[PDB]
Structure formats: C-alpha cells, structure tokens
Structure 1
Amino acid sequence: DLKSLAKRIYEAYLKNFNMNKVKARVILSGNNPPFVIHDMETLCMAEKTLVAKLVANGIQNKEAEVRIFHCCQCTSVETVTELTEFAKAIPGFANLDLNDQVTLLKYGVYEAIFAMLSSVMNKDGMLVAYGNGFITREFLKSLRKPFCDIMEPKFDFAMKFNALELDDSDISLFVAAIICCGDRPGLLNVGHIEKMQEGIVHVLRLHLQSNHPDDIFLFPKLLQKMADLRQLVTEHAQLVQIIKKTESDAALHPLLQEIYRDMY
C-alpha cells in the first residue's frame, strides 16, 4: 500500500505536467522540432511563430531581456497552475486546512519549479514554449545585467541534479516531498503536515532503495538538494525584486506577485 502511495503520486505527476522527463529528453536529443533561439535574429523568428499576437502588439520594439523575462513569467504561471493541481492530488493534501494548502504551495512552488526545470535543461540550453523552443545557455548568459543572472544558477543546479539520473517516478516523489514541508512560515497545523511529510519521505526512501540500488547515499543527497533549492529560491526572489523595482517594462504578473509577497 506504500506502493499505492507511490504509484498515485507518480500518476498524478504524469497527468498534471504537460512536460515530463521522458518527453523532454526525446526533444533534447534531436515533426514540429524546437526552434533554436541563440541570437536576436532567431529570437525574433521564434516569436513571430509562437506568440504572433504579441509581435502584432509590437513587443519586438522592447529589449530582448524584457521579452525573455515575460516569457519566463508566463511559464511560471502555467507551472504553478499545474503544481497546484498535482498537490491537490497528493494523498492527505486536500484534507489539510485550506489556509495551509496556500501556505505550502506559496513556499513550495518555486522549489518544485527549479527541480523540474532540470528535466528540460541540458548543458547548452532549455526547452521553452511547450517543447517548440530551445533557448541556449550562452544567449541567456549574453543578456545585459541583471537579466543574465536569472537562468545560469538554475543551469548550475540542474547539471548536478541531472547527474543523479533520476526518472519521473523519483522526481514526482521528490516534488511531493518539497510541497509537503512541515517547517514553512505561517503553518496552522504543523503536526498533520509533518505526519504527511514523514509518510512521503518514507515512500521516497523506499522507492530510491528499489529504483537506485547502486547509489548508496542517494536519499541524503536528495535531502541536500532540497536545502539547495530553498537557498536557490531565496536568491531568485531577491533578483526578481531587484528587477521589479528597477526595470521598467518588467512588471510582475499578479499570480506571481502574490507568491513573492511576504515570502522571504
């Protein structure tokens, strides 16, 4: 029945995220292949195909950094939506207080985002636009400050995360564990969430034992990546606040505004 819990989480994962690791690595290996975005010329081409209403609105008059930022925001909104439904399908979660649900998701969504973002990254770039764009690490490094600092720390995390060779069945449990975290600020009923977390991590521990018998400390490694992600998000939010207050035209979508409000 612990395999029940694992298979349920995994199936809710396969069902709620449009992009999964199996699908992503196919696209990242080589009908409707991804348009490679590596300079301004290819960015403009890709935009004319994938966001024609925006181009018609004149977005290509804006700095490339602003369009990339708003592309990033749009993807974050979509993934928050998917993560919210995934969480809703985690055994015990929807039994939690409605206030604590919002708290767990508020603090957890970006840790889960950057964990799953590794699935669509390789050492040269990341998939965007539902698999129909591949924007290169170097083009993103090439942007003006502060925008060139957005993505490279996520690439750094992802290269070491992907070195662990986790599959979607591992990742789904990792993300569940990320979300069911008993030490978030603001939690009403911490004891239930800890009992929920304990149950998820126990399943994760058993699953890694079965699925990766060759990596002796993989479970402790993953706990450390959880700490690494929380520090990554803290730093990300500070760079995002710098851009919000400093960069005109880089306004914050309201769903994301509310996530960052009173976070760190």
Structure 2
Amino acid sequence: MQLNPESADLRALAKHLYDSYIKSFPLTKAKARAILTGKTTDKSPFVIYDMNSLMMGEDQSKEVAIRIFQGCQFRSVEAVQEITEYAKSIPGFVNLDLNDQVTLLKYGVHEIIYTMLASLMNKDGVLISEGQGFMTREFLKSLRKPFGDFMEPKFEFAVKFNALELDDSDLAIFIAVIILSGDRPGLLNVKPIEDIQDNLLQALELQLKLNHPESSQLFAKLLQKMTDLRQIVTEHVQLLQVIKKTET
C-alpha cells in the first residue's frame, strides 16, 4: 500500500462523507459513547427501567406499550429524513434517475436505522430523546406482545456490531456503501449505481485498513454485516405489518 493520488482522493471522499454525516445526524457515535460510558460534561440521561420510571419519564393512547411504539415511529420518520439528506451529499447520488434515488432509500433506510441504533446502544439499553433519556433492554422486552419483541433483534445485531468498534469515519462510508446497493428491486439504471458503490467500497477498505490495525479482514466482515442486515430488515418489515393488522 502506497500514499498516492488515488489514495488521497479516497481520503477526501471519506472526509467529505464524514463531515456530511456529522451534519445529518447531530447525535454522533462519539457523543453517544461519552454519554453511555459517563465520560461527558453534558446532561445525564434519565433511565426508564420500570413502569414507574416511565411515568416520571413522560414527565393520545391509554396503553404505554402503544405510546412507546408511537414515539419509536416518529423518530423513524425523522431518521428516514436524515438518511435522505445524507444521501444527497454522496457524490453521484442526486445525478441518478430520481426513481432510482427513491428505491435506494426505500429499500435501505431500515438497514441504516439498525446501524445508527447500535451507535445509541450498550448491553443495558438505548439512548432516546437526543441523549436526554435511556430505556433499558429488559424493560422494552417487558412490554406485552407483539411490542416486547420489537427491539430485541436490534439489540442482538447491535451487541455483535458494536464489538467491531466502528467510529463515525468508518460508519459514514459503511452507510453510503449500503444506500448504493445495485440489487434493490426495480432499479432502472443499475450500472451507474454500481459505479458509485465501487468507488465507495475502495473508500471503505482504505478507511478500515488505516483505522483498524488489529482487524485485518474487517472490510470482509462489514460486507457479511451488509448481508446480515438483508434478512434482519425482512424479519422487521414482516412483524411490522403484524402490528398494522392487530393494533387498530
């Protein structure tokens, strides 16, 4: 490996997605990790760990399980928006056939939501309300069916993913690689998507080699994850309609 014109341009592309990413998602993995790990001057989050801590926490539906799912829904809408905003700053993306831009984000946002959640998760739970709150894994599990199980696959994915210790520089280009997946169903101009993805995949490999001396095949194992995330989002999509069929 040599530091040359092509390598320096993969570094500028990495830096440009990193800044663009720090823009679109205010709550970065770095400040998320300072909050989870207590290493912040910032305000300390309020822990929701039982039904009583949730009441004070709130401080319409009657049902606390439904009400939490609703909150989960709204953040998702905001997340889909932030991911689209990010996508506009990926060199090539705004130039693609508008319909193709839509299929990419359509079929990608759920995989990107699983990834961004890991950033907000440790073994105890997930940061909520821009770091102002923390909801414990086991309490979310404590909600009646079918809500009790909704987030558990998120925690499963997030436990093994976070073990890779990816930072914001890696994640920005991880997310850009996902969005430009040339296999999303009904894509009018594939060859052009795959051209942006090839450039993004070189930018990813160089990143991980420079940033992760102890993980020799981390690039290979980020691709396995991008595979993992296909069946995960299926399972999420298919239970997410169960709730549309059984909850008014």
Aligned to 1:97: 97
Match of 1:45 among 44, 47, 56: 56
Aligned to 2:138: 138
Q: How do 1:116-131 residues align onto structure 2 when only pairs under 5 Å count?
A: 116-131=116-131
Distance 2:162 2:141 in 1: 20
Aligned to 1:27: 35
Look up the SS of the partner of 2:232 in the other structure.
Answer: helix
Distance 1:126 1:218 in 2: 25
Look up the SS of the partner of 2:130 in the other structure.
Answer: coil
Shift of 1:32: 3.1
TM-score (norm 2): 0.93
Q: Does 1:226 align with 2:226?
A: yes
Distance 1:221 1:158 in 2: 14
Q: How many residues align?
A: 237
Percentage of pairs with the same residue: 64
Distance 2:36 2:74 in 1: 21
Look up the SS of the partner of 2:198 in the other structure.
Answer: helix
Look up the SS of the partner of 2:67 in the other structure.
Answer: helix
Amino acid at match of 1:201: L
Look up the SS of the partner of 2:131 in the other structure.
Answer: coil
Distance 1:39 1:207 in 2: 41
Q: How do 1:108-187 residues align onto structure 2 when only pairs under 5 Å count?
A: 108-187=108-187
Amino acid at match of 1:42: S
Following superposition, which runs of at least 4 residues in structure 1 exceed 2 angstroms of deviation? none
User: RMSD of aligned C-alpha atoms?
Assistant: 1.0
Shift of 1:93: 0.6
For structure 2, the 5+ residue unaligned runs are 1-8
For structure 1, the 5+ residue unaligned runs are 49-57, 249-264
Shift of 1:38: 1.1
Residue by residue, what CA displacement relative to the aligned partner does 1:151-205 show, whole Å, maximum 9, x if unpaired?
1111010010000011110001100101011000010100000111111011101
TM-score (norm 1): 0.88
Residue by residue, what CA displacement relative to the aligned partner does 1:194-228 show, whole Å, maximum 9, x if unpaired?
11111101110111111112211101100000011
